[PDB]
Specification:
part of a larger assembly; 4 chains; A mainly beta (215); B mainly beta (219); D mainly beta (148); A: 215 residues; mainly beta; five-stranded mixed sheet; four-stranded antiparallel sheet; 5% helix; D: 148 residues; two-stranded antiparallel sheet; 0% helix; 25% strand; elongated; binds a molecule of 2 linked components (NAG-NAG); Spike protein S1 (chain D); viral protein/immune system; SARS-CoV-2; Spike
Amino acid sequence: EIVLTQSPGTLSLSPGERATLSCRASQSVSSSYLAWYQQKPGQAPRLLIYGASSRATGIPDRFSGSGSGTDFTLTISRLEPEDFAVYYCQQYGSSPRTFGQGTKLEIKRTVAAPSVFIFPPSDEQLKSGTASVVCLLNNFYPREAKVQWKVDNALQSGNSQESVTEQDSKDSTYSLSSTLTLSKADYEKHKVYACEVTHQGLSSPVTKSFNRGEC
Amino acid sequence: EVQLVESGGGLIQPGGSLRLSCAASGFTVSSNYMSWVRQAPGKGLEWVSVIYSGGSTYYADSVKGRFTISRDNSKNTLYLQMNSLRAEDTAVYYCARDYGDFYFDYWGQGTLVTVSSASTKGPSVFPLAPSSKSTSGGTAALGCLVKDYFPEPVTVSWNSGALTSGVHTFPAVLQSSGLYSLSSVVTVPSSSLGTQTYICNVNHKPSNTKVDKKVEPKS
Amino acid sequence: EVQLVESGGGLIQPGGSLRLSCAASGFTVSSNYMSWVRQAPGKGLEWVSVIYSGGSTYYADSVKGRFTISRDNSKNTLYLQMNSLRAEDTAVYYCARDYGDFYFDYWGQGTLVTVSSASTKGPSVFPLAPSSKSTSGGTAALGCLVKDYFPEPVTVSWNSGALTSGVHTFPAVLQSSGLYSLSSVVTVPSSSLGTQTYICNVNHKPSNTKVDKKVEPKS
Amino acid sequence: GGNYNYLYRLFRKSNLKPFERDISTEIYQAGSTPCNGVEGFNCYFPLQSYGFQPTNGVGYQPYRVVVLSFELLHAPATVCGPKKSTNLVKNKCVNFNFNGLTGTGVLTESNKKFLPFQQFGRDIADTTDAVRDPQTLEILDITPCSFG
Ligand SMILES: *[C@@H]1O[C@H](CO)[C@@H](O[C@@H]2O[C@H](CO)[C@@H](O)[C@H](O)[C@H]2NC(C)=O)[C@H](O)[C@H]1NC(C)=O
């Protein structure tokens, strides 16, 4: 059977060191009839190496793929930091051309705590009849951050949404935005809105909070 | 060898039909293979179809009986006519120049195929003011919240593209209502709360919405 | 014997086609007759079509050559596929379980078939404030005016469904512009003009409009 | 080690007419610019070799192919299949066929001598009365079997 399965699925490292990864099939393939690909997020995916032997032009030589059969590896001899992307394996031996799922390559910049900031809803929105309460977490290595909303000290579950940015190409940090959504009516029923952030760079969690209706 | 621009995709109700176009440049588009490949936004890469230099075509099994590819080598324009549109063929698609072993060496830019759903609505914008609760020492953050729109590709710039420092647009979020929402924020020295210009330029390309909103400290 | 929910109807431009669905529950839908009956909103009840347990169908003479009924007894779902839609087939329709003599004993819920006209527009809402001209002694009345919408089924509640005393929504009116309008009013003790919460919750189901408007005494 | 001496073309401007043939290998241009008869970008070699090995999977094995293509049209056929030859009795009214000559009668050893290109002999009043056996090339008389 022909299904490409990544070994780890993601790798977080530090630049300047030898990177090595593989992609595993679901059968032995006819000889070296596969390839690799990389994907820059927000960009087009690009060639990596044909036939698992030699790569095409426009690519330098820090990279090497090997293997035979089910196992097929790819080794980067030294971690260039600007090469941090999502990397794919691709086959062309079977009668369809199947793919895998990708491997994430990045770095673990020294533990950095987030700058936290809470934004109350704008007066324009309370006219409309709804209240968004935004809480921002700025720059931060470990993305495994927790955002606990509290309304009058009641932990709020199921009315928030988060999103997170791609690891920053300059300082290798993440940034996160959590939005709490309420009705105008329900907003006007409570006083303290708080956002409590937990993170490895914080010795104890940080809470940023405001009091509805206090200039 | 500068080539493979894509165009045409976007908001379309199911049951319709669409011919996409991937034009190339500086290349004999007749005497090779091209291909189509999808990219589901949470998932990987899945091959759609191929053409030959002789002209023979092949497709995926799911898109069998539905999708027709063609080209005009007088104008060097590949045509992906997709028909009987279902609400799971919602990926972004890529035209790809093909070589030999069916390596996809040269790649297109991409265009969004979005099945009907909530139609196309324009964004509602609010300015999130810089505040002392956002202020800390030397810097303070301000931004713009652009919410409730269906047609996924939307952009917000700061000062017509001037500020590139601290400007960070966060991934749009898909609500239960079915409409997207996002917020883009930028930090700026706290000595400069209202001093200079900070106007977010909101442009919605599937529609034709263009609005500039100024963000100022709270009253 | 709890059964016959209907769904599917609404805003549709003429010349189109629609398959309606009436699903039932707790019943062998194969081994009986079903039927369809219309109800013009100013007029009486007019039979549309019948099916047999063997499977033979019959129709009205006006809908001859146009309308096809069917069912799936694997999923117990009746299908009324109506085609070549004219702008006089604008009634609400009812699936009906049939017995014997062709009595329609068990009845559906209903769904609106509305031919194209002015398309689908959202409502504009104003609060009609409680005033001394509405006040008399112990009580005073306040309400919400929801106007200019095409897609007939629209609802306004008071305080998320809390107040059931004095809340009275008046029949929508059809203007010369072609759009509907209505106003729902509720009386409340005059000692309680602004005291408690009186927010009208406007929901437009063919669209996805949901807005809460507070009504307060005049400035 | 492998057998890469078996190749195939993988590029052409168009398809083929039935049993067309091309041996001419030229650097197949997709550049729209002439490339000196030399290789490089968008001018490639039109042929591809087979990569074979004994540990290849099923289907990736050398399969020796032969096709048949027949000729009929007008004119006189030149090819022909095989032929059966039971045996020849003698002195037993029999139903015989000698490469076309269909008849009935008793067959008997002869003592006439044809010329070495004559197949059968005829009587006055034109009835076949002798034949030559194709396999052994001996003359046999044909007498009718008895009636009266
Ligand atoms: C036809 O084939 C037969 C063999 O099947 C040839 O025959 C033999 O002829 C030789 C001649 O001396 C004899 O000694 C053998 O006894 C024969 N064997 C059999 C099996 O008959 C014969 O010569 C061939 N004739 C022609 C014209 O090809």
